[PDB]
């Protein structure tokens, strides 16, 4: 019963952003996309930050627990799992920045087996409910077939692992998927639809510094009045995946919890001076700081987009407002998409102005799929004991 509400939670959010697992609205999330693990060319998946993942002690954590034990975000997320049975934790591997070893990792018998084995090792040790694979992006036809092979091998390993150790609990397997046709036209979309639980469409980052003119980063539709403002659209991607034979109910609509700025611009589809400053990097603003004083929120309903515009500084910021999320959820319902997805947790507003909250509110009820709280083969005593 219900809808997917999947949320990226970055292991580095714990530092400057000061955002810990316990601050998640765990009762409104069905999938935490715990990000990211790294990978070697030989397929070996590894932690990019063991302190954040497993070693950081929160004030609840003891230094002298009996045995070998997990702390960090791992223990914190497991705690949340116990209190919210619809909350699945996904081990996210790769991402935009760490995708350069994927081709080689997917390349052979051996490398794919190593990937599957190492990834499931983490899932079963850390007490997670599945694996989310974020290869950004397969380039060749060879890559595309190798991706199917890899996800199949991971699938095989999850199924075997569950048979021995989880009493047949159906661990999940998902991907982050391209909304750009140059990437998605390379994928074996139907085969991906068959093997995966969910395909999380990355329906964002459509415009940025790499464009000659300002644009909408996450619009539903092409703008016919102003086409230069819409180099992509979610509609085009969703249609292409459905037409390809991906079941609608496996497509989860990704949305940004952040803005992409264009400074010194007349508006959408115009020359801009610079992407300007950001919250944590140039040109990108946390949703929780938007809109800024002096900016008016604009809705373009034909293009299916919102943006803030400041006429004085000539600054446009492409982001999703709560009403925009409602509008997207409404579009997704009309196609029977499986639910919503967000990058990323830390930036969201609190209370009703939360995008994650607005999504669930619009979607109806939350995915009833229970998580797993049995990890007998965990190398971590506290996880195999389910923190009891």
UniProtKB/TrEMBL annotation:
Query: Which residues belong to any copy of the GH18 domain?
Result: 3-366
Q: In its keyword annotation, does this UniProt entry include Secreted?
A: yes
User: What GO cellular component term, any one, is given?
Assistant: extracellular region
Q: Where in the cell is it found?
A: Secreted
One Pfam family linked to the record: Glyco_hydro_18
Q: Which family does it belong to?
A: Belongs to the glycosyl hydrolase 18 family. Chitinase class V subfamily.
Q: What is its EC number?
A: 3.2.1.14
- GO BP annotations, alphabetical order: chitin catabolic process; polysaccharide catabolic process
Q: What does the UniProt keyword field contain?
A: Carbohydrate metabolism, Chitin degradation, Glycoprotein, Glycosidase, Hydrolase, Polysaccharide degradation, Secreted, Signal
What is the catalytic activity of this protein? Random endo-hydrolysis of N-acetyl-beta-D-glucosaminide (1->4)-beta-linkages in chitin and chitodextrins
CDD domains tied to this protein: GH18_chitinase
Q: List GO molecular-function terms, semicolon-separated.
A: chitin binding; endochitinase activity
- Name it: chitinase
Q: Just give the chief location class.
A: secreted
Gene3D superfamilies, from UniProt? 3.10.50.10, Glycosidases
């Amino acid at each position: 019963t219900g809808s997917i509400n999947a949320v990226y939670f970055t292991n580095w959010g714990i530092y400057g952003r000061n955002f810990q697992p316990a601050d998640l609205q765990a009762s409104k999330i069905l999938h935490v996309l715990y990000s990211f693990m790294n990978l070697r060319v030989d397929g070996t998946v590894y932690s990019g930050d063991t302190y954040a993942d497993l070693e950081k002690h929160y004030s609840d954590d003891s230094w002298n627990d009996i045995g070998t034990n997990a702390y960090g975000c791992v223990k914190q997320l497991y705690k949340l799992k116990k209190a919210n049975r619809s909350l699945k934790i996904m081990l996210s591997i790769g991402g935009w920045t760490w995708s350069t070893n994927f081709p080689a990792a997917a390349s052979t018998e051996a490398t794919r087996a190593t990937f599957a084995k190492t990834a499931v090792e983490f899932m079963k040790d850390w007490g997670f409910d599945g694996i989310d694979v974020d290869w950004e992006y397969p380039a060749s036809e060879t890559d595309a077939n190798n991706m199917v092979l890899l996800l199949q091998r991971v699938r095989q390993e999850l199924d075997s692992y569950s048979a021995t150790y989880a009493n047949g609990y159906h661990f999940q397997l998902s991907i982050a998927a391209p909304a750009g046709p140059s990437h998605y036209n390379v994928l074996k979309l139907a085969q991906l639809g068959s093997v995966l639980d969910n395909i999380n469409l990355m329906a964002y980052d459509y415009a940025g510094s790499w464009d000659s003119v300002s644009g909408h980063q996450t619009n539903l539709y092409p703008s016919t009045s102003n086409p230069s403002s819409t180099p992509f659209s979610t509609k085009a991607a969703v249609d292409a995946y459905i037409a390809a034979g991906v079941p609608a109910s496996k497509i989860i609509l990704g949305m940004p919890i952040y803005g992409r700025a264009f400074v010194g611009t007349d508006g959408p589809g115009k020359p801009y001076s610079t992407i300007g400053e950001g919250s944590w990097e140039s040109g990108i603003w946390d949703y929780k700081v938007l809109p800024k004083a002096g900016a008016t929120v604009i809705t373009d309903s034909a293009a299916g987009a919102t943006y803030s515009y400041d006429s004085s500084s000539r600054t446009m910021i492409s982001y999703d407002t709560p009403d925009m999320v409602r509008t997207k959820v409404s579009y997704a319902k009309g196609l029977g998409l499986g639910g919503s997805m967000f990058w990323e947790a830390s930036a969201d507003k609190t209370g009703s102005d939360s995008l994650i909250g607005t999504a669930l509110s619009s979607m109806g009820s939350h995915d009833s799929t229970q998580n797993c709280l049995s990890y007998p083969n965990s190398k971590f005593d506290n996880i195999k004991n389910s923190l009891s």
